[PDB]
Amino acid sequence: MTEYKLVVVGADGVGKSALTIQLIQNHFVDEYDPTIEDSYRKQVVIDGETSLLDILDTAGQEEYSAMRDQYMRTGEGFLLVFAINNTKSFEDIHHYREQIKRVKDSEDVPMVLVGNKSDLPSRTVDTKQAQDLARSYGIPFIETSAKTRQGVDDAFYTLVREIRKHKEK
Numbered sequence: 001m002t003e004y005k006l007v008v009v010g011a012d013g014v015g016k017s018a019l020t021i022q023l024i025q026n027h028f029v030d031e032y033d034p035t036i037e038d039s040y041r042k043q044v045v046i047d048g049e050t051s052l053l054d055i056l057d058t059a060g061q062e063e064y065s066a067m068r069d070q071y072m073r074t075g076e077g078f079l080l081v082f083a084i085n086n087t088k089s090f091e092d093i094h095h096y097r098e099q100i101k102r103v104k105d106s107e108d109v110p111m112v113l114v115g116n117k118s119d120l121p122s123r124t125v126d127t128k129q130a131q132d133l134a135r136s137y138g139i140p141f142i143e144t145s146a147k148t149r150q151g152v153d154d155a156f157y158t159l160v161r162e163i164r165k166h167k168e169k
């Protein structure tokens, strides 16, 4: 079986944990403990290959130690998550991408930009704004709802496929 280390990053409250649990357990958990950082495993067949996804759902205090740097460096691909009704969480994406680039020592790291909470009508981040950011980064952009499950599988599997591409270069 091939193992993939995925890391889900982004501001508090954007739905990182909801997305992760939807993928793992196939249901929407509304108010999952905002402080728990943990990793979750799922076995799935993707494009004919049996794969073990090890998903780190990030949380907790903002700190920049060598210990945390090495922890994050073990990730092979990153989901950058913002909420489409929270402009600050979108503006924070630059920060998260630069910290990834810093610890991986590379500008070519598999990443996918996710705009979550698409089920809401109160949108503040334009789809064109978000797409344009992803195009300048050269990475895929997918809008999701952990509540309705729209796009969840697609976001995670697109990241797996990006990692496969990057290993085949």
Ligand SMILES: C#Cc1c(F)ccc2cc(O)cc(-c3ncc4c(N5C[C@H]6CC[C@@H](C5)N6)nc(OC[C@@]56CCCN5C[C@H](F)C6)nc4c3F)c12
Pocket: 009, 010, 011, 012, 058, 059, 060, 061, 062, 063, 064, 065, 068, 069, 072, 092, 095, 096, 099, 100, 103
């Ligand atoms: C992630 C990651 C992260 C990566 F992807 C990659 C490498 C990393 C290497 C690190 O050593 C460490 C990280 C790492 N761990 C936690 C962070 C964190 N906490 C506060 C809340 C919001 C999420 C959760 C975790 N709880 N928060 C903010 O950024 C916050 C903001 C708001 C106040 C000040 N800053 C700077 C920007 F303005 C945004 N960054 C964080 C960070 F970089 C890394």
Ligand SMILES: Nc1nc2c(ncn2[C@@H]2O[C@H](COP(=O)(O)OP(=O)(O)O)[C@@H](O)[C@H]2O)c(=O)[nH]1
Pocket: 011, 012, 013, 014, 015, 016, 017, 018, 019, 029, 030, 031, 032, 033, 034, 116, 117, 118, 119, 120, 144, 145, 146, 147, 148
């Ligand atoms: N309407 C809606 N609410 C969501 C969605 N994803 C998460 N939530 C809610 O957003 C809040 C924060 O989500 P959580 O998964 O804890 O975010 P995290 O801090 O990034 O782990 C919770 O009340 C969730 O139930 C979504 O796709 N749609």
Ligand SMILES: [Mg+2]
Pocket: 016, 017, 018, 032, 033, 034, 035, 036, 057, 058, 059
């Ligand atoms: Mg969480």
